[PDB]
Amino acid sequence: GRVRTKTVKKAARVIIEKYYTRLGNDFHTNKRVCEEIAIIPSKKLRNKIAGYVTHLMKRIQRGPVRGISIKLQEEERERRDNYVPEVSALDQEIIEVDPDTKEMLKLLDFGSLSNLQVTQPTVGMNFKTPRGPV
Amino acid sequence: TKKRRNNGRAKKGRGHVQPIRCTNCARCVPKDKAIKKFVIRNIVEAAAVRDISEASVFDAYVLPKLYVKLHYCVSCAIHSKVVRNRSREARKDRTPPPRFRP
Amino acid sequence: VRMNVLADALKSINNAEKRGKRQVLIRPCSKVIVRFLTVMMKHGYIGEFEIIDDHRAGKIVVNLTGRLNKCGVISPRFDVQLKDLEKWQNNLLPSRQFGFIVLTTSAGIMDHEEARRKHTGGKILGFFF
Amino acid sequence: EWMPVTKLGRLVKDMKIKSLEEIYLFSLPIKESEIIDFFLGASLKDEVLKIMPVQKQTRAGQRTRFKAFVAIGDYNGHVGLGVKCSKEVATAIRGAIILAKLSIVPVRRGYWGNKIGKPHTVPCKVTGRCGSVLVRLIPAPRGTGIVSAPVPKKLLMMAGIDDCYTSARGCTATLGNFAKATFDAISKTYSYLTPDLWKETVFTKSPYQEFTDHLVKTHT
Amino acid sequence: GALDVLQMKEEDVLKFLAAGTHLGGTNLDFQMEQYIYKRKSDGIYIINLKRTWEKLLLAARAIVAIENPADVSVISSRNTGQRAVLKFAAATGATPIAGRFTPGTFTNQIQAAFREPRLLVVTDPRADHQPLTEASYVNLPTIALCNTDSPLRYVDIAIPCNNKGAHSVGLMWWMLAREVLRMRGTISREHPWEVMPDLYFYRDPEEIEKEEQAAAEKAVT
Amino acid sequence: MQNDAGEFVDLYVPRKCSASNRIIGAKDHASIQMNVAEVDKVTGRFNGQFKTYAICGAIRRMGESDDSILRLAKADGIVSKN
Amino acid sequence: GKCRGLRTARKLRSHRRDQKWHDKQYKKAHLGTALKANPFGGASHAKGIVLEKVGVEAKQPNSAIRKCVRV
Amino acid sequence: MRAKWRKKRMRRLKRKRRKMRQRSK
RNA sequence: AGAACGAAAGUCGGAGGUUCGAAGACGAUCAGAUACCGUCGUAGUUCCGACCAUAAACGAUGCCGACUGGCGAUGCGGCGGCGUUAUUCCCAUGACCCGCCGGGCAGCUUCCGGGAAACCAAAGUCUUUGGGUUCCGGGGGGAGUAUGGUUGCAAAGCUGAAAC
RNA sequence: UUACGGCGGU
Ligand SMILES: [Mg+2]
Numbered sequence A: 001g002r003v004r005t006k007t008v009k010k011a012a013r014v015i016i017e018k019y020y021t022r023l024g025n026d027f028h029t030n031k032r033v034c035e036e037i038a039i040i041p042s043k044k045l046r047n048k049i050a051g052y053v054t055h056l057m058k059r060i061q062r063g064p065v066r067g068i069s070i071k072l073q074e075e076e077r078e079r080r081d082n083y084v085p086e087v088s089a090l091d092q093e094i095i096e097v098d099p100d101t102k103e104m105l106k107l108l109d110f111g112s113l114s115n116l117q118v119t120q121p122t123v124g125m126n127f128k129t130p131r132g133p134v
Numbered sequence B: 001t002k003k004r005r006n007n008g009r010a011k012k013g014r015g016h017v018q019p020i021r022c023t024n025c026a027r028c029v030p031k032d033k034a035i036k037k038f039v040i041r042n043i044v045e046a047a048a049v050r051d052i053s054e055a056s057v058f059d060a061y062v063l064p065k066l067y068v069k070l071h072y073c074v075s076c077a078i079h080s081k082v083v084r085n086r087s088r089e090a091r092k093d094r095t096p097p098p099r100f101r102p
Numbered sequence C: 001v002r003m004n005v006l007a008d009a010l011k012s013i014n015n016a017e018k019r020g021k022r023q024v025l026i027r028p029c030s031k032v033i034v035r036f037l038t039v040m041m042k043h044g045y046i047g048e049f050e051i052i053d054d055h056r057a058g059k060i061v062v063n064l065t066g067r068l069n070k071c072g073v074i075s076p077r078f079d080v081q082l083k084d085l086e087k088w089q090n091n092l093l094p095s096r097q098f099g100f101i102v103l104t105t106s107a108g109i110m111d112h113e114e115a116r117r118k119h120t121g122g123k124i125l126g127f128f129f
Numbered sequence D: 001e002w003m004p005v006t007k008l009g010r011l012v013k014d015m016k017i018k019s020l021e022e023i024y025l026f027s028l029p030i031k032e033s034e035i036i037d038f039f040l041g042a043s044l045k046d047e048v049l050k051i052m053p054v055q056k057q058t059r060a061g062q063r064t065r066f067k068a069f070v071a072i073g074d075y076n077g078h079v080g081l082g083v084k085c086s087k088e089v090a091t092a093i094r095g096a097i098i099l100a101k102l103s104i105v106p107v108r109r110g111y112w113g114n115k116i117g118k119p120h121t122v123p124c125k126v127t128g129r130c131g132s133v134l135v136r137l138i139p140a141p142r143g144t145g146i147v148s149a150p151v152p153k154k155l156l157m158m159a160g161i162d163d164c165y166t167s168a169r170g171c172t173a174t175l176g177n178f179a180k181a182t183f184d185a186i187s188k189t190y191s192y193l194t195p196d197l198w199k200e201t202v203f204t205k206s207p208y209q210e211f212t213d214h215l216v217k218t219h220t
Numbered sequence E: 001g002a003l004d005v006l007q008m009k010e011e012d013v014l015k016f017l018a019a020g021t022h023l024g025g026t027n028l029d030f031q032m033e034q035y036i037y038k039r040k041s042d043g044i045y046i047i048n049l050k051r052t053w054e055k056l057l058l059a060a061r062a063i064v065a066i067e068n069p070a071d072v073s074v075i076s077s078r079n080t081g082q083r084a085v086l087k088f089a090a091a092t093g094a095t096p097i098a099g100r101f102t103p104g105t106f107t108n109q110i111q112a113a114f115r116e117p118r119l120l121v122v123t124d125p126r127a128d129h130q131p132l133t134e135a136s137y138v139n140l141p142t143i144a145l146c147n148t149d150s151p152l153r154y155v156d157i158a159i160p161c162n163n164k165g166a167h168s169v170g171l172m173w174w175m176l177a178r179e180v181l182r183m184r185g186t187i188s189r190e191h192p193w194e195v196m197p198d199l200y201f202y203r204d205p206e207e208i209e210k211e212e213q214a215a216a217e218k219a220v221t
Numbered sequence F: 001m002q003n004d005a006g007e008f009v010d011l012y013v014p015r016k017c018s019a020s021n022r023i024i025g026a027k028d029h030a031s032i033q034m035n036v037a038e039v040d041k042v043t044g045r046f047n048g049q050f051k052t053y054a055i056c057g058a059i060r061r062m063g064e065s066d067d068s069i070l071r072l073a074k075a076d077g078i079v080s081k082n
Numbered sequence G: 001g002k003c004r005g006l007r008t009a010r011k012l013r014s015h016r017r018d019q020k021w022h023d024k025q026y027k028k029a030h031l032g033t034a035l036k037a038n039p040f041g042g043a044s045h046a047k048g049i050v051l052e053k054v055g056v057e058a059k060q061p062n063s064a065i066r067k068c069v070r071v
Numbered sequence H: 001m002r003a004k005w006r007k008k009r010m011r012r013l014k015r016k017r018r019k020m021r022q023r024s025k
Numbered sequence I: 001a002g003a004a005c006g007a008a009a010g011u012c013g014g015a016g017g018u019u020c021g022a023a024g025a026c027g028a029u030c031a032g033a034u035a036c037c038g039u040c041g042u043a044g045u046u047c048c049g050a051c052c053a054u055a056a057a058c059g060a061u062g063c064c065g066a067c068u069g070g071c072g073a074u075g076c077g078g079c080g081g082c083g084u085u086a087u088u089c090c091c092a093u094g095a096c097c098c099g100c101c102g103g104g105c106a107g108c109u110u111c112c113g114g115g116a117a118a119c120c121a122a123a124g125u126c127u128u129u130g131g132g133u134u135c136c137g138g139g140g141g142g143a144g145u146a147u148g149g150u151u152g153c154a155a156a157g158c159u160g161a162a163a164c
Numbered sequence J: 001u002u003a004c005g006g007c008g009g010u
């Protein structure tokens, strides 16, 4: 019987998207803010909206919830834009190939242009996981 | 309407198969329409395993299994609910249900 | 058991032109179907085709251009007179602007328009447009 | 008052696309009905075909919707066909015109022979199938008229075509399908390669790349 | 590219081979017999890189031939490819769609999620097929960087590289982002482009911040 | 379409596919017309002009558009010459 | 499949004359038993004397007595 | 009535009249 | 035209006769049970010989021929290859493994196209209609009935109407 | 385990 309707959840998401700078994990403070900052027609859904806000307060302090509020949206610039690492994951100059694909780059005329040590491949040819239920 | 592509039966390049008999009702079905079920039920009924091994004359006795093959007419396969009616698009698969033993 | 060899070849051309293919392979070659194909190559439907000489009946590889709509065959080689030809035209041609019922005469395998520029009614052999 | 949302309707209200016959030849998906109302305004008469009361079985009684069939078109080579379910006739018959002009095709006109002047019939004999009905529109000689059933003659005279022999197989008393079958035959007169269309087409510049100015400079 | 300027530039082989990009997986579609070199003894098809270089140039020749740069829509559904698809839009000035692609984007003209692009480029044909079959309705030519697994139904300039590992996808976004700016007046073919290919790769799991601050006790402190 | 008067009596001349040579219809909404922009020889940048190819939707749905667009770039001086 | 070759016109014409006996309106017009059986004997009108008025009852949806004779 | 048992009650009936014609020759 | 073969039941004669089991007897259950359920049980089911020629005898799709997408698998031959396992401590053939080709029972995919649709890689290549050829259909019933003929020991089979 | 029916036209 606790489960909250669509209009309580929808209108509380537009607060935390928009007034996250003013809210905290206290019920009785946010109950006063949502009174001042939204137009709530009656008192029961005032503090029923404000309860879902504080439920969203502990929820967004852990991780990326459906939370397009600015601070959670800005910090992912420190992940996808930053970490251009000072070392390369492409440049090691000791990389392995196989004796069939050392034929491949020789007709590409890059056989003596590269270092490119080879590894001899297994002759087992076991590829193709067993058919049938057991 | 033809309901199924094969006619409920796995015969293709034949004309006649052996007829077998249902287990509970003893009805004559062909061998390749009948709903088969191979049962490897333990004969000891696992609630009574720690009641016979302490009466056993051994200290580690590997209990025999019971090896029963069932094969049903489909008239009794649905009534005993070993198979269930399926929807017209979830029906076109022959894959068996997952096991879920422990 | 190939009762008609023009019928099989020209069925084979028709399936690949609607399939989008640039070449076909026609397994028996004949002197009726190399004179058949140089009536539509001359009117401009197919391009360069090669006869593959073998010691049994040869093969034909045709370069399809894309300008072909249908290249059927009238399978009983009916006889058509020049009186009777005008009611063959309006049955199995899409229009009077284009398309040819190609028919074998005593003077050679011709068009329908070549058949009446000469006076050479013959046996109907196929049609193409 | 009509503001558009797509490029093709945005580039028409500023009168930069001229004479529709290029947005056919680039095969644009027309989305709003006001583009076809813009070019061919004051040349469209819009007369209905049948209004049939389809209905479904429900828990108590029967939902009755209405199925209005209207075909639109000038006398110069454009036809439409509009079909729409709605709860009431007057709004089914209204929105079907919106569906009829939005699905509009050019019909190609040809000659029976002796190409003396304006084209008057179908260029070749053409077919359309929809369900079980096939309608075969056959090139007629000059001075024939439309030799057909009443309802495909409603679309042929609305195609600006002078004369056409016609045959039809099937349940021709299935007016919804017997109108879509005749619509499909005159929808493929430009989809049929005749020997006047052999030479390799020079490709002109499409209005989405020729009018990148008005989306970059004026829209943005 | 039939030139000498647009040739293979042997350095890239040191990046292609260090990031996969030539390993088809298990089986090959029948429309990719021509992009392949041979099957290994591992069962893996390995890919003629000359064929995947001639396609990677060909795709940017259409994208350069799109006049407005923020008009090609670049899309990616699987996560291995969601970081690279954003940055590419940020590189060439395109418009990205990452995550879920809501159907009705290209054809339902009512709602405000209505993109109307002239060309589209895909991370994976078989996993991100919903924009492809919707591009069939609004006459839109599509590129899709594809593996031997994938079908090629509505695609046109299918890049036969790889779409499976994390490093191969981000590099092929990088090699394509590089080469579309290099057909314009931004990179002069001589100086190598300073944006690192490790920038576009799929992001690690959650020990990201922990490893870097475990190795930053002499630059912050 | 050149009547005996010698006049063009036609609404438009429709495009035709460069692969299958068949006519794109008026509402074949899968037919693409896309451009392939060539470069100059000596420096490899976009010189201004391009080349157009129309691929009809019937041959596009069949799934060898890439076999098509490569084959007409092979014949028209772009891809590889080997 | 059917016959088509420039020699089968005996087979096709013999196949048509015996399959026309399978629609009714050829069969009642060319077999002869249908006109040796109708009361008119192949005419349009007939005089006859009235034996008995009889009132037959209409079909189930309706309900009335249709007035008839026994000529 | 089943089509195989419409068949039985006429095969039973056309042997009953095959005897009545046979009785009254 | 004319032939051979044809499930099951059925018929005649001879061996057999465990099981099952039409008919039948009884028990039950039921308002009634000439049914389902139970006990018993004849004909029969088994073999031999002679008959009968029909089945939802079905893939409800005639046979032969060609062309037209893909993929994995199977079965029988054939060819070609890393390796592993067999007296083999070396062989040649086996057994597995990776392909290819041919014929086969199928399967999954596919806007090839078809279709009234269910669905079919054929039921595709059909109003853009013609690859050969045989049988057969023409609203529902009456009716696979009547009658003539013919086949059978019989049961019946083939042929097969009309009035209405 | 037993459970059978529901006049005609709208
Ligand atoms: Mg019965």
Ligand SMILES: [Zn+2]
Pocket (backbone or CB within 6 Å): B022, B023, B024, B025, B026, B027, B072, B073, B074, B075, B076, B077
């Ligand atoms: Zn049972």
